[PDB]
Design a protein around this motif. Structure first.
Motif: not given
Lengths: 502, 475, 349, 493, 184
Positions: B22-30, C336-348
């Motif tokens: 989720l726009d935050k890089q994480r690191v991890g060791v297995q 949507n109804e088409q099936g495509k979950v289109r994803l955004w990013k609130l850059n704040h």
RNA sequence: GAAGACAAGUGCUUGUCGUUCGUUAAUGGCCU
């Protein structure tokens, strides 16, 4: 009402009764929700999850009148599915074994006890083990010859059990009973279900045969007779459920017990046949036709006798040639091709009719050669090649009237590769006999030439067969089974546990 | 690919991997030898892991950064112990480590020297005539770290002490991906997106041999003493080499090739395989971000070998409480009869103006409309005479076609019962001569038996009627 | 890059919900499937993908319990009598809540449900619950791990939606609050900690044909809490309509008068509101309509100004049927109804 | 927890001659319509390829009926005198017809106006004209001239081979599937001839004796043919050169025969035969040619044939009588935007990872009596047992499963006189059967100890009680006299 | 040549020697609710809850301390009264089971691991009367037993403490009742 | 059969007994 339990909140109340149903009372609106049938009555309800997660409960299995038969059952609260049910193996003994007092209901039946009839039974039940020696406590058990599961005819059912994994794998009902249709309540508790009394496999193992007796209700016009129903069942090796192909109502006419059954071996008809002996001594040969998918009577032999011997046993000759049959005081040798006496042109007095001293309890043969016969009083060993007895053993002190007739057969089996084991039982007392018993296992070979091994078990032993892994299996009062047989590493340790207000 | 940057420890018991969450890089060791819910979350959205390296007393990994500083991560607790901060702020393109000394690459081409023990920047340091640099590895001369190797499309052998470029090596057209020192003479250069590895010589300054994979080269690993080089291919394959440094000798193709194809048939991508002496380690992503591993012994293994894995591609769910269909595993199974045949033990098997000839005619053939023309006759003198002039073999077949009509029609055994008796009367002497009466007259014997058993029950009901009937008529 | 591109979907995407701690998305619709997509900027692959047979799946939520933080059940239901509860490895653990311990006569379907935490207050033990809808005013409350029918909450009229406030009382103690909506626009305030009594009633100003309410600015069912101290009382309340009208209520002032004036009447959409979700920080109000294509509008808070730049004309949405925010990273996932979950990013964020 | 078991209906021990599974297939042929023709119908043969049509001979007429409409599609009538046999080729396009003027006039079917090829065969009347099964262009006719002529219909002016040696009146020939060269030809003297057409052919290879005049000959297997001749019919094995079976289970002389194989049936291979009694019986080569099912038609039956295995429609058993009758018996056989918003229903879990189905199968609907016994309404379940639109089986299954489960008195304590009369009006019927009389004996006796006191007040019960007195004493007299035979029967044993 | 042995276990050993308690179940689910522990009449079984099978049995025939207590053949009188989950001795060391017998004996056992053949036995003193029921609060322990001077059994309430010494247990007489019909 | 104990009736009688010694019927019904 047998047990109540509140939840951890206190807004729900579990119940328990002779009706086989866990009812969840809401105390707020006084509604309820309930599982209908739970394999016998429910003794003690118990909610275990701190979130209210699991219902856990105890079962009695009131179908057995001779043993407390506890099935510990656990459930998910959410789905109410039986999750991880645990049950010991359940035999059914001939009588109430040891100090076991049936749970309390409203009215005294033969399936339960009243309040006033509670202590009057327990006082009496001690006397049956004090007044009488007639008590046997024997269990019919048959072994599956291809899967080595251990079927117990718990009444109107079969608990398919295996002792290697020590676990119940099935519980199939085998009768048109009243079993899952209704939990029996206090006047209806007099109605006992039909009783499977015999259960054998063919040597194939693909066929299981079933003899049971349905009982009438009391106070009816037909409360005197007894229907003797026979059933012939199949399954594959893949599936664990059984399937019925021929039900048989009343072999040998009406009201005739068929008390002794021996299956056919692989030599005669690839082990797809069975024989049934009456109290009169009639022999029918049930077997399986091919173009029909069903069973018929290929050969009958029907005598009509003035008397009824309720102790019969019979043995088969491994070639498929001739049938040994035991009636009271009297052996019969039948040519299978004719179902008559073995008529001899030799006239060397190798007579099909033998005359024994007491009523036959077992007929067992080691091979084509030997033949081992236990009467009511004695055990004998007679060869087939010469018709002269080899070894006499007076079992009259150990067995006088200790067994109801026929029940000796389940104690004594013959490993066809090694030999015989008879199972001798004592009760032991200091200074009225005690309740505790003592059973001795003795190993025999070649119509009792020698005692190969005397093994003295400290408790009772109720049944022996020999598993086809060249070993004998025995039950006990406590339902036990016994076999008579022959820097980075330190960095690895810390990561093992660590990974798993303001 | 979900795994951005992955690297093994030496001796191949662990790997760090760096993935986005989720726009935050994480690191991890297995672990790889035979989970780990613990992770290190990078705080900012913007700072990104750029180069990664382990340390052979806590087991620490070193994180080269977008930021301008070097994080230092201990794996036991998710804590970053100390930060090595370049005063300038460009991304660190390469990181290197041996002993106390550390060495890294600024994106403004500036070398740096850090101590793990002393926690201190030794020298801000730049050199001439290397204008872009993105991979640096130091030669293992001994405790003397000197004359280290740096490259970006062309390798320079550059001393520390005289701080000049000694040897200038030809290189690639792409920027170099992998640059590792195998032996004290020889080392590999590998480019980004190229199928070609070089094997160069430090002292000679020449190429000895080159190595060729069938697709683009993503990640490199090599055995202890130059025996085995296992190249992770971008298509997802491990093109390994056996004795690459021994003597068409200019280019050497791959010796053994490893694919992973799942049980349903899909191809699984391989990233970052480890090799040690005579023991190969594969990795792949089983779920979206969970890596699973497999140690395998590879000199046993043939030239081409597809490790096949059970993936639940269409696996139907087996709830342990549930049966194969519908019901519980602890529920009892019901007595269901269904299509059973129900038989009695009495049912044997497998053990002068007359009407004679017309009756005899419908028994030779089987004819049912013509029999019922016969059986309307009811005068017993006809019934006596018709059976009398009949073949005795036909009378046995007649009785079987009687009891079938007697059984299936209950009222019918009123009038037919006289027509059964005279059959038995006239042809009784013949009927002794047939050997199996119970077999042939089975359906006769079965119908007469079932009427016989009702005799005690019906006589029982007679009295209990005539209890009442003798009662209520008088009063 | 899309959330469905690595494995597409067939039916119209009905409900999305991220994981409160993990990176995951739960796409599921009338396709009788659950799909779980791990989310990156580059690739978004299937974690797994569950297909139920015979049950269309109209709402889907992850649920991490407030006590354990290791249960992570997945509750999904449709237009059936039951509700499957998949737990969180070839064999899946799936429980189904087939039975209502009081009465099935009110609710015939589980097609709308929300899952909330709750405290016992005899014991200071927190379990989840499942909030349902029912016949005419019934909101039934099933215990989330046992299926016990807890408490029945009737309102006047016809329910269209509901939402769940959380009030913190002290440290370690909080009470949860139902906010049920009559179709005509009467807002009920049931509290679940004690047994269900009304706290208060208040009519929305206007608001005749009302579809959906969801509260926000704190912990909601879309952006839930982790420990008990994280539970924060909300600040914004939004009331949908069948005529585009969203009404914003400041929850500090509107709890006084009990017939409160809403702050601003948002009317930028032209059709029936179908998704009102807030940002986890409580600064953005999505509003969407499943009737017309390309109909998501973002509303800034507290200024009540619709954002003007995004969405443009050329912003691919489709008939928006399922909107969801991230709890943590500030992402935005729009179905949507088409099936495509289109994803955004609130850059704040 | 267990599911509720369905109440299992009572199944008596089986009375003899049950409905065998081959008697469930051949009795499906119903809706028998009878078409009058002007004279005796002689041969009937089906179109092989798409079997929807069968030709039917008559006096000077070959008609073509349909499968589904069962009426005349087309009618051939250009013949001068009576036309005996009308087969189709194995292609299905083109049929034959042999006349009484001795000419076989082969032409295409579905086109009665173009006599494509008029083979002037012998001047004696040709009875049988068939096409070869293997090679589709060689015809073979027979004649009254006692010679069978294999005509190649490239050359309709010369017989390709004169196949001869017959003593008297060849009126059937049939080909064999494994050998295109070998031809079974049956005279009327007996003596089935077997020929090799690649040999000289004027002598047979080997003959098969049929002691009585053989009238029909049909190959059944590649190794077996069947002699349908006189009273009995006999099968024959060619490589054995010896008969395998014989079934003289008929009455009068046979006329026709038919074999069909691998069709939608419990019996794989069917062998039907006419017996000139109206009596078509069905035999099978898997079960040693035992008799399986029989029809009886009004007059004597001459031609009979069945639709082939490739029928893929309603089958036919068409039998033709001498009196002019055909007898046919047959076995018969929203918007777009609304569908885009809900389209997931036909997906059925194909490419997802885990498929999980909890849904239990919809069982059979529980009957009105079984719904009452499950909800313990016993006194109402007994009153629900005696509905006139209810089978005599199920009423017995109530009374067992009401006697076995509870006692019978509890359902009976609340009964008034008016609720008691549906019981006895069944019980007056109930004791007459042997299948119920052991059970109705209980249900009557529990009434009399219960409601004999009411029975004085009700004269309406008394008439049923006097009628019950008679029929039980009648069922004594059956059970006495049927006992009298079994003691008598043991003499002869 | 031949040998006798014991293979399969029997009953689940319900608390019917009480016959006064309506909560007869001895079995407990673990802290980590992954495995379920039942004392059979012949053994102690640990069933896994998910995989539904036995994951470990604990036969009494294997250990001399177990066989000295339960597999005694002259007296079948001693029986498992109640398992407790944690270590009575040490605060929170895991995979331990403490087992309370019918007659004042305590066995410390190990599921999830190989059974160490030297358990921490602690025979409870003042067990003249036979032990009937034990239960615990957080670190506070009480005891219910059956005492007798009508044919009914009087119940005495006691308490437990630890680490006066190892083997010692102070038994406190919290309460007493004169005769009991249904203690629950 | 006895003792014991308790209840009802008017010291006596009947009744019961989660006791001992001795012989062999609370409107209360089975999920989804």
């Amino acid at each position: 009402v047998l047990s109540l339990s509140f939840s951890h909140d206190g807004s729900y109340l579990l119940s328990g009764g002779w009706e086989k149903v866990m009812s969840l009372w809401q105390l707020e609106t006084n509604s309820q929700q309930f599982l209908p049938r739970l394999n016998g009555i429910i003794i003690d309800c118990q909610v275990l999850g701190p979130q209210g997660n699991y219902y856990s409960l105890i079962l009695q299995m009131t179908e057995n009148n001779s043993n407390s038969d506890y099935q510990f059952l656990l459930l998910n609260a959410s789905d109410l599915t039986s999750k991880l049910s645990i049950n010991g193996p359940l035999p059914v003994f001939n009588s109430t074994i040891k100090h076991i007092q049936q749970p309390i209901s409203a009215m005294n039946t033969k399936n339960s006890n009243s309040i006033t009839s509670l202590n009057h039974s327990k006082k009496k039940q001690s006397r049956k083990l004090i007044k009488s020696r007639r008590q046997d406590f024997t269990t019919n058990v048959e072994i599956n010859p291809i899967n080595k599961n251990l079927y117990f005819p718990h009444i109107s059912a079969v608990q398919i059990f295996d002792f290697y994994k020590n676990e119940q794998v099935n519980y199939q009902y085998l009768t048109s009973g009243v079993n899952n249709s209704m939990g029996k309540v206090r006047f209806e508790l007099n109605l006992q279900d039909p009783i499977i009394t015999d259960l054998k496999f063919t040597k194939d193992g693909q066929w299981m045969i079933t003899y049971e007796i349905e009982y009438p209700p009391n106070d009816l016009l037909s409360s005197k007779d007894l229907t003797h129903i026979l059933k012939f069942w199949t399954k594959n090796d893949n599936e664990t459920n059984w399937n019925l192909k021929t039900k048989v109502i009343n072999p040998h006419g009406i009201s005739v017990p068929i008390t002794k059954i021996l299956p056919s071996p692989r030599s005669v008809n690839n082990s797809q046949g069975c024989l049934t002996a009456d109290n009169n001594g009639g022999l029918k040969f049930w077997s399986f036709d091919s173009h029909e998918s069903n069973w018929c009577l290929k050969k009958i032999s029907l005598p009509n006798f003035n008397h009824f011997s309720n102790s019969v046993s019979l043995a088969w000759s491994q070639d498929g040639s001739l049938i040994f049959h035991g009636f009271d005081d009297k052996l019969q040798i039948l040519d299978f091709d004719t179902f008559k006496k073995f008529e001899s042109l030799e006239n060397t007095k190798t007579v099909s009719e033998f005359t024994l001293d007491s009523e036959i309890q077992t007929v067992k043969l080691i091979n084509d050669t030997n033949l081992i016969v236990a009467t009511r009083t004695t055990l004998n060993a007679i060869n087939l090649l010469r018709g002269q007895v080899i070894n006499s053993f007076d079992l009259y002190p150990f067995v006088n009237g200790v067994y109801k007739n026929g029940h000796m057969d389940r104690l004594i089996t013959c490993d066809e590769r090694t030999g015989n084991i008879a199972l001798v039982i004592n009760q032991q007392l200091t200074d009225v006999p005690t309740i505790n018993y003592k059973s001795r296992i003795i190993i025999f070979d070649s119509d009792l030439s020698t005692k190969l091994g005397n093994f003295t078990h400290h408790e009772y032993i109720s049944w022996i067969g020999w598993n086809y892994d060249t070993d004998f299996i025995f039950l006990d009062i406590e339902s036990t089974l016994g076999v008579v047989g022959t820097x980075x590493x330190x960095x690895x340790x810390x990561x093992x546990x660590x990974x798993x207000n303001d | 690919s979900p795994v951005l940057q992955s690297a093994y420890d030496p001796s191949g018991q662990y790997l760090c991997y760096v993935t986005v969450a989720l726009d935050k890089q994480r690191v991890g060791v297995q672990p790889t030898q035979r989970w780990n819910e613990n992770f290190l979350y990078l705080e900012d959205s913007k700072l990104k892991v750029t180069c990664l390296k382990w340390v052979n007393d806590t087991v620490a990994i070193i994180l080269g950064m977008n930021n301008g500083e070097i994080w230092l991560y201990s794996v036991l607790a998710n804590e970053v112990t100390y930060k090595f901060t370049t005063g300038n702020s460009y991304e660190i393109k390469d990181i290197d480590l041996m002993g106390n000394q550390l060495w890294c690459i600024d994106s403004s081409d500036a070398f740096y020297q850090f101590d793990l023990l002393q926690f201190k920047l030794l020298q801000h340091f730049r050199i001439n005539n290397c204008v872009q640099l993105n991979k640096l590895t130091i030669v293992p001369a001994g405790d003397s770290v000197a004359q280290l190797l740096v490259a970006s499309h062309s390798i320079s052998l550059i001393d520390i002490e005289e701080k000049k470029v000694v040897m200038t090596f030809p290189g690639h057209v792409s920027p170099v991906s992998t640059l590792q020192v195998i032996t004290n003479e020889f080392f590999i250069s590998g480019a980004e997106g190229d199928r070609f590895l070089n094997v160069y010589d430090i002292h000679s300054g020449m190429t000895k041999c080159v190595l060729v994979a069938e697709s683009d080269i993503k990640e490199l690993s090599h055995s202890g003493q130059a025996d085995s080089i296992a190249v992770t291919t971008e298509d997802g394959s491990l093109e390994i080499f056996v004795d690459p440094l021994v003597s068409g000798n200019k280019s050497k193709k791959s010796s053994k090739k490893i694919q992973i194809v799942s049980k349903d048939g899909r191809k699984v991508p391989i990233y970052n395989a480890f090799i040690n002496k005579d023991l190969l380690n594969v990795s792949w992503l089983q779920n979206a971000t969970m890596p699973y591993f497999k140690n395998l012994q590879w000199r046993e293994i043939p030239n081409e070998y597809t490790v096949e894995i059970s993936l639940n591609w269409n696996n139907k769910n087996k709830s342990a409480d549930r049966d194969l269909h519908g019901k519980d595993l602890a529920s009892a199974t019901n007595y269901v009869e269904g299509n059973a045949r129900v038989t009695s033990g009495d049912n044997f098997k497998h053990v002068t103006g007359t009407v004679t000839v017309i009756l005899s005619q419908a028994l030779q053939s089987n004819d049912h409309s013509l029999l019922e023309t016969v059986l309307n006759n009811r005068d017993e003198r006809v019934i006596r005479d018709t059976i009398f002039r009949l073949k005795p073999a036909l009378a046995v077949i007649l009785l079987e076609r009687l009891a079938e009509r007697i059984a299936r029609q209950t009222h019918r055994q009123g009038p037919l019962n006289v027509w059964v008796k005279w059959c038995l009367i006239i042809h009784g002497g013949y009927l002794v001569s047939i050997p199996n009466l119970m077999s042939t007259l089975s359906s006769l014997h079965s119908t007469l038996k079932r009427r016989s058993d009702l005799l005690p029950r019906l006589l029982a009901l007679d009295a209990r009627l005539d209890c009442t009937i003798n009662k209520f008529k008088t009063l | 890059k899309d959330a469905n591109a690595s494995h597409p979907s067939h039916s119209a995407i009905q409900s999305l919900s991220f994981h409160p701690s993990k990176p995951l998305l739960l796409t599921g619709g009338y396709d009788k499937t659950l799909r779980i997509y791990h989310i990156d900027g580059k690739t978004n692959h299937l974690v797994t993908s569950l297909h139920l047979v015979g049950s269309p799946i109209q709402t889907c939520t992850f649920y991490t319990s407030l006590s354990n933080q290791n249960q992570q059940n997945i509750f999904t239901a449709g237009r059936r009598r039951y509700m499957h509860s998949w737990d969180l490895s070839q064999t899946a653990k799936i429980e189904k809540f087939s039975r209502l311990y009081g009465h099935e006569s009110t609710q015939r379907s589980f097609e709308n449900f929300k899952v909330a935490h709750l405290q016992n207050s005899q014991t200071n033990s927190v379990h989840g619950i499942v909030l349902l809808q029912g016949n005419n005013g019934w909101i039934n409350i099933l215990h989330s791990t046992s299926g016990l029918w807890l408490m029945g909450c009737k309102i006047e009229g016809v329910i269209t939606d509901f939402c769940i406030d959380y009030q913190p009382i002290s440290r370690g103690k909080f009470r949860t609050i139902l906010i049920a909506v009559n179709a005509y626009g009467e807002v009920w305030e049931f509290d679940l900690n004690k047994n269900g009594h009304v706290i208060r009633r208040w009519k929305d100003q206007g608001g005749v044909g009302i579809t959906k309410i969801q509260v926000g600015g704190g912990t909601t069912t879309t952006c839930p809490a982790l420990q008990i101290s994280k539970i924060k009382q909300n600040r914004w309340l939004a009331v949908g309509s069948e005529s585009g009208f969203v009404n914003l209520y400041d929850r500090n002032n509107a709890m006084t008068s009990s017939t409160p004036t809403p702050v601003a009447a948002l009317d930028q959409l032209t059709t029936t509101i179908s998704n009102l979700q807030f940002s986890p920080d409580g600064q953005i109000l999505c509003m969407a309509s499943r009737a017309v294509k390309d109909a998501l509008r973002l509303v800034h808070l507290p200024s009540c100004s619709v954002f003007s730049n995004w969405p443009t004309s050329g912003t691919p949405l489709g008939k928006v049927t399922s909107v969801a925010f991230s709890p943590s990273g500030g992402l935005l996932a729009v179905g949507n109804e088409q099936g495509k979950v289109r994803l955004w990013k609130l850059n704040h964020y | 927890s267990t599911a509720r078991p369905r109440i299992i209906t009572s199944k008596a021990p089986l009375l003899p001659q049950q409905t065998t599974p081959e008697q469930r297939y051949w009795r499906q042929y119903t809706s028998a319509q009878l078409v009058k023709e002007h004279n005796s119908v002689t041969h009937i043969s089906f179109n092989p390829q798409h079997p929807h049509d069968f030709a039917v001979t008559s006096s000077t007429r070959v008609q073509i009926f349909s499968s589904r409409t069962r009426q005349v599609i087309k009618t051939f009538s250009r013949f001068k005198d009576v036309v005996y046999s009308a087969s189709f080729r194995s292609d299905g396009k083109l049929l034959c017809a042999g006349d009484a003027t001795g000419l076989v006039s082969v032409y295409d079917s579905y086109n009665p106006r173009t006599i494509l090829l008029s083979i002037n065969a012998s001047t004696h009347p040709t009875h049988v004209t068939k096409f070869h099964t293997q090679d589709n262009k060689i015809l073979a006719t027979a004649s009254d001239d006692r010679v069978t002529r294999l005509w190649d219909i490239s050359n309709a002016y010369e017989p390709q081979l004169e196949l001869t040696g017959a003593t008297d009146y060849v009126r059937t020939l049939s080909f064999i599937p494994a050998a295109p060269h070998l031809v079974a030809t049956g005279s009327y003297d007996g003596l089935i001839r077997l020929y090799d057409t690649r040999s000289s052919g004027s002598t047979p290879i080997y003959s098969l004796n049929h002691d009585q005049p053989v009238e029909n000959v049909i190959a059944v297997s590649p190794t077996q043919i069947v002699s349908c001749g006189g009273n009995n019919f006999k099968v024959w094995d060619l490589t054995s050169n010896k008969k395998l079976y014989e079934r003289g289970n008929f009455n009068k002389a046979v006329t026709c025969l038919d074999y069909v194989e691998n069709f939608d049936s419990p019996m794989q291979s069917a062998l039907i035969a006419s017996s000139l009694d109206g009596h078509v019986k069905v035999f099978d080569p898997l079960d040693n040619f035992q008799v399986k099912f029989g029809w009886k038609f009004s007059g004597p039956v001459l031609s009979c044939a069945v639709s082939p295995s490739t029928a893929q429609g309603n089958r036919h058993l068409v039998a033709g009588l001498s009196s002019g009758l055909l007898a046919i018996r047959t076995k018969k056989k929203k918007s777009n935007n609304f569908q885009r918003m809900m389209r997931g229903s036909e997906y059925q879990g194909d490419q997802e990872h885990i498929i999980h189905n909890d849904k239990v199968r919809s069982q059979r609907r529980m009957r009105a009596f079984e719904r009452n016994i499950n909800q313990f309404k016993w006194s109402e379940a007994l009153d629900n047992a005696f509905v006139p639109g209810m089978a005599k089986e199920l009423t017995l299954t109530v009374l067992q499963e009401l006697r076995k489960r509870g006692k019978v008195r509890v359902a009976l304590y609340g009964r008034d006189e008016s609720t008691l009369e549906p019981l006895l009006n069944w019980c007056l019927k109930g004791i007459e059967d042997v299948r119920s009389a052991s059970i109705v004996a209980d249900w009557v006796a529990v009434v009399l100890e219960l409601y004999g006191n009411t029975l004085e007040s009700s004269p309406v019960l008394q008439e049923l009680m006097i009628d019950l007195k008679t029929k039980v004493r009648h069922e004594i007299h059956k059970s006495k006299e049927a006992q009298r035979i079994e003691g008598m029967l043991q003499l002869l044993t | 040549q031949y040998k006798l042995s014991v293979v399969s276990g029997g009953k689940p050993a319900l608390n019917n020697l009480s016959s006064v308690t309506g909560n007869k179940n001895i079995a407990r689910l673990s802290q980590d609710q992954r495995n379920y522990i039942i004392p059979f009449n012949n053994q102690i079984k640990v069933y896994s809850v998910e995989t539904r099978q036995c994951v470990k049995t604990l036969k009494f025939a294997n250990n001399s301390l177990l066989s000295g207590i339960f597999l005694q053949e002259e007296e079948n009188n001693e029986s498992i009264v109640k398992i407790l989950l944690g270590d009575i001795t040490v605060p929170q060391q895991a995979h331990l089971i403490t087992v309370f017998t019918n007659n004042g004996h305590v066995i410390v056992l190990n599921y999830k691991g190989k059974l160490v053949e030297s358990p921490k036995h602690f025979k409870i003193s003042l067990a003249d009367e036979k032990l009937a029921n034990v239960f615990h609060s957080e670190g506070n322990y009480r005891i219910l037993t059956t005492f007798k001077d009508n044919s009914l059994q009087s119940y005495r309430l006691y308490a437990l403490t630890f680490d006066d010494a190892k083997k010692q247990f102070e038994v406190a007489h919290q309460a007493e009742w004169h005769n009991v019909i249904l203690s629950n």
